[PDB]
Enzyme design. Structure first.
Site, PDB file in Angstrom:
ATOM      1  N   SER A 146     -25.060 -17.008 -13.460  1.00  0.00           N
ATOM      2  CA  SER A 146     -24.023 -17.148 -12.388  1.00  0.00           C
ATOM      3  C   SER A 146     -22.862 -18.049 -12.898  1.00  0.00           C
ATOM      4  CB  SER A 146     -24.685 -17.678 -11.131  1.00  0.00           C
ATOM      5  OG  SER A 146     -23.826 -17.377 -10.031  1.00  0.00           O
ATOM      6  N   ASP A 203     -25.355  -6.306  -8.532  1.00  0.00           N
ATOM      7  CA  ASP A 203     -24.679  -7.607  -8.598  1.00  0.00           C
ATOM      8  C   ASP A 203     -23.142  -7.451  -8.678  1.00  0.00           C
ATOM      9  OD1 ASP A 203     -24.036 -10.266  -9.014  1.00  0.00           O
ATOM     10  OD2 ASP A 203     -25.122 -10.436 -10.928  1.00  0.00           O
ATOM     11  N   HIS A 256     -28.315 -10.284  -7.935  1.00  0.00           N
ATOM     12  CA  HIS A 256     -27.905 -11.401  -8.778  1.00  0.00           C
ATOM     13  C   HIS A 256     -29.037 -12.406  -9.032  1.00  0.00           C
ATOM     14  CE1 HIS A 256     -24.708 -13.973 -10.480  1.00  0.00           C
ATOM     15  NE2 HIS A 256     -24.967 -14.959  -9.595  1.00  0.00           N
TER      16      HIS A 256
END
Ligand SMILES: *[C@@H]1O[C@H](CO)[C@@H](O[C@@H]2O[C@H](CO)[C@@H](O[C@@H]3O[C@H](CO[C@H]4O[C@H](CO)[C@@H](O)[C@H](O[C@H]5O[C@H](CO)[C@@H](O)[C@H](O)[C@@H]5O)[C@@H]4O)[C@@H](O)[C@H](O)[C@@H]3O)[C@H](O)[C@H]2NC(C)=O)[C@H](O)[C@H]1NC(C)=O
Ligand SMILES: *[C@H]1O[C@H](CO)[C@@H](O)[C@H](O)[C@@H]1O
Ligand SMILES: [Cl-]
Length: 279
Positions: A146, A203, A256
């Protein structure tokens, strides 16, 4: 050329899925209190931790027989990537003074990610040099997820450019865009065969910041599709037109924070300690 979009078809995933699975656990553990005596994650021993994911991303440094001195950077939401793109966190800027002299003129990087890396970089370089020497270890692997994946890309370049012995590998999960086309092509030149960007399912985070703000990914990623499955392909080149935008994104963090080659990167919600290979 600079700023292009590859049209090549995808090919079978050539990356080491054991290494990916381990790397996913090494970074999941950065979402967790990492202060335990002698913690082990997969094949790796934790040597060092700093930060707690409130003011700065937690950074964990391990020794691993397969990955060397592995530096993993947390990616909790110190700012939001789904926020107003006009805000200063998303502006492009020159490389920081610490490494500007290593980059091509006209390189630009996203402020929010660069500033967060610059808060950590000298402590990271001191700790990596310390543990490389303690462990007689030449190989340095940088891992992030991330926001920490974009910080991890900047750190992986910094190690290749400025640290004696350079970078071994980088594994980056759910990687946002970080730099402009000059930057993206320089990543290919300096670490292209060491670079691994893993995108799970639907994602959305690898679509931001958008290309219309001057941002470009380096070449190649492996897309796990369906999300959380064991089926994956490599989409070659920069911004491959056959890749993730061909399936509508989701606008939550489910994939994600999904399963990457049998390891969950659930983030703050996830598993503490991390569990390599548990799914
Ligand atoms: C890929 O994997 C990731 C996880 O790594 C998935 O991300 C999660 O996505 C869900 C929505 O699909 C989010 O929603 C929350 O889910 C919480 C977790 O719920 C599961 O685990 C519970 C505890 O064991 C379990 O009780 C629960 O079962 C119950 O609900 C089910 C339906 O949700 C039902 O089918 C069961 O029979 C039972 O009643 C779930 O299995 C849940 O507690 C919350 O209420 C909320 O629903 C999670 O937040 C996401 N997790 C993360 C870490 O972000 C992702 O969806 C996966 N991708 C795909 C395509 O499936
Ligand atoms: C993708 O397609 C382009 C033309 O659209 C080719 O030039 C390229 O080699 C690839 O086959
Ligand atoms: Cl903190």
């Amino acid at each position: 050329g600079r700023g292009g979009s590859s049209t090549d078809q995808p090919v079978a995933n050539p990356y080491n899925t054991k290494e990916i699975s381990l790397a996913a656990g090494l970074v999941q553990q950065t979402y967790c209190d990492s202060t335990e005596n002698g913690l082990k994650i997969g094949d790796s021993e934790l040597l060092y931790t700093m930060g707690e994911g409130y003011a700065r991303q937690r950074v964990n440094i391990y020794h691993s027989p397969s990955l060397g001195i592995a530096v993993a950077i947390e990616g909790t939401n110190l700012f939001s990537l789904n926020s107003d793109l006009h805000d200063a966190k998303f502006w492009q800027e020159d490389p920081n003074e610490r490494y500007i002299q290593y980059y091509p003129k006209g390189t630009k990087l996203m402020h929010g990610f660069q500033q967060a890396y610059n808060d950590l970089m000298d402590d990271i370089f001191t700790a990596v040099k310390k543990y490389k020497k303690e462990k007689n270890e030449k190989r340095v692997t940088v891992i992030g997820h991330s926001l920490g994946a974009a910080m991890g890309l900047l750190c992986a370049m910094d190690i290749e450019l400025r640290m004696d012995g350079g970078l071994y590998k980088t594994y980056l999960f759910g990687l946002p865009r970080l730099g402009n086309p000059t930057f993206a092509s320089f990543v290919d030149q300096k670490i292209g065969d060491k670079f691994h960007s893993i995108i799970n399912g639907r994602d959305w985070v690898p679509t931001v910041p958008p290309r219309a703000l001057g941002y470009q990914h380096p070449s190649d990623y492996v897309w796990i599709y369906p999300g959380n499955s064991t089926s994956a392909k490599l989409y070659p080149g920069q911004e491959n037109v056959h890749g993730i935008l061909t399936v509508a994104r989701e606008f939550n963090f489910d994939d994600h924070q999904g399963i990457y080659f049998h390891t969950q990167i659930g983030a703050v919600m996830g598993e503490c300690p991390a569990q390599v290979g548990a799914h």
